[PDB]
Design a protein around this nucleic acid. Structure first.
Length: 406
DNA sequence: CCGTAGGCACGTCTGCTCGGCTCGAGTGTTCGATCGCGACTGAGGACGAACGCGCCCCCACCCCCTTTTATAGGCGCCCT
């Protein structure tokens, strides 16, 4: 059970962008430092980097007191955008080995760490302890390969994906800088996980699929309801211009569709007119709005449009998505293939063009039929096992390489 | 007679309707594969017929009964 932060659950901006142009899609999950137009750090010259130690201790203390003040047990702390800052709480880094994994979290979403352990035969004294995560004793593997007896494997686990992770040490040279309009802050950060290839648990839709079109529609609908809720006017009213600015690729006519059932156009002598909430229309509750569209569904959709943009950039037209190698790497194909195989509907290529590492240390998620048929499945498991073990060994290794001069 | 107001026209924006295109779903037909049945072949075992071997009988061949006579050494037995 995953409980996301309130800003994420509410699909607030900027945590959940309403629109992304080509540039943003290319930079998806890699935001570049952009200059500020105003505020302290818009100014030239040196700027102080501030310590956070007193602040970190204080927030931990305040949070624990709030915990004891009601009057123990479990509390949920991620209620406001302010609670999501890197400025307090314990922090880890996670570095993703896939250049563009099929699903990624937005800021404000939650994930668990699970410590998968397989018992040694006979008298097992229990799993080793880890600094992070909750131990899970598993007789069957949640991955493509099987755990060996006595093997502990850490992993990220959420509704988008499961992925093995490997704990490493941050280099002694490195610090985390947090940057706001107001100043820089610095934190020590020692724990950094390498993330291995994802096992997708959520299916990414194809471009212009019914699923995709239903999603943008519903997301637009949610944004609209939230606009009415934000309005302080009675009767509530919103401006077309504000919707168009958030959804610049929607025609005014398609926006009028979403508005015709809940609101009335009020014309004024000025090129700004209002849509006023109908007096017999009951605005959906917070709880009902949340049920309309989940953060996971937004993540699936984002994955599609970003991939679609990268494909266009590489010369692959919409008619391409009998199929080109590059199109096989698309998240709508890889997630579909992996999930089908998880349900026993087919097997996976494993060795193939969709291996995200390009060098045999990752899996190619491409459907092959279940179609000597005990040898067919034993060969699939053997190959899965080999790559599974290879990935764990390479990504957990502390060996120092050796810059490639090419 | 002069100035102000009103009306008309034009443009822009929004909404509604109509048409066209695309996508999806379902149903039907055709093709391929699998399964089943039958036939053939091969192998092994059993039964019957023919040939060979073994056993018994028969046949064949040779000498063994006797007589005669000349000759003469050695043996053993009868009663003188």
């Amino acid at each position: 059970i995953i409980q996301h932060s309130i800003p994420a659950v509410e699909l607030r901006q900027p945590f959940f962008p309403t629109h992304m142009g080509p540039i943003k899609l290319r930079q998806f999950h890699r935001p570049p430092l952009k200059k500020y137009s105003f505020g302290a750090l818009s100014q030239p010259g040196p700027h102080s980097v501030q310590p956070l130690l007193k602040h970190i201790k204080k927030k931990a203390k305040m949070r624990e007191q709030e915990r004891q003040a009601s009057g123990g047990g479990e509390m949920f702390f991620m209620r406001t955008p302010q609670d999501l800052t890197g400025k307090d709480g314990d922090l880890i880094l996670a570095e993703y080995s896939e250049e563009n994994g099929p699903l990624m979290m937005q800021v404000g979403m939650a994930t668990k760490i699970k410590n998968y352990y397989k018992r040694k035969p006979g008298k097992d004294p229990g799993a080793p302890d880890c600094k992070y995560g909750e131990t899970v004793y598993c007789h069957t593997s949640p991955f493509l390969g099987s755990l060996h007896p006595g093997q502990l494997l850490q992993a990220f686990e959420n509704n988008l994906f499961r992925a093995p992770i490997y704990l490493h040490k941050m280099p002694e040279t490195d610090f985390l800088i947090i940057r706001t309009r107001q100043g820089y802050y610095i934190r020590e950060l020692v724990d950094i996980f390498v993330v291995g290839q994802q096992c997708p648990l959520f299916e990414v839709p194809g471009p212009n699929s019914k699923r995709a079109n239903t999603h943008i529609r519903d997301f637009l609908q949610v944004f609209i309801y939230r606009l009415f809720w934000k309005s302080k006017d009675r009767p509530r009213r919103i401006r077309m211009e504000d919707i168009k600015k958030a959804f610049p690729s929607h025609s005014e006519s398609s926006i009028r569709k979403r508005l015709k059932l809940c609101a009335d156009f009020k014309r004024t002598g000025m090129d700004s007119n209002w849509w006023v909430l109908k007096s017999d229309f009951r605005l959906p509750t917070e709880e009902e709005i949340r049920a309309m569209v989940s953060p996971e569904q937004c993540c699936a959709y984002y994955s599609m449009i970003a991939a679609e943009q990268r494909l266009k950039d590489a010369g692959y037209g919409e008619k391409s998505f009998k199929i080109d190698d590059e199109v096989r790497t698309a998240p709508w194909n890889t997630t579909r293939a992996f999930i089908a195989a998880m349900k026993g509907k087919c097997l996976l290529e494993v060795t193939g063009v969709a291996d995200p590492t390009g060098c045999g240390e990752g899996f190619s998620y491409v459907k092959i039929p279940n179609k000597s048929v005990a040898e067919h499945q034993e060969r699939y498991k053997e190959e899965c096992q080999r790559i599974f073990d290879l990935q764990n060994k390479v990504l957990s290794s502390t060996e120092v390489l050796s810059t490639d001069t090419d």
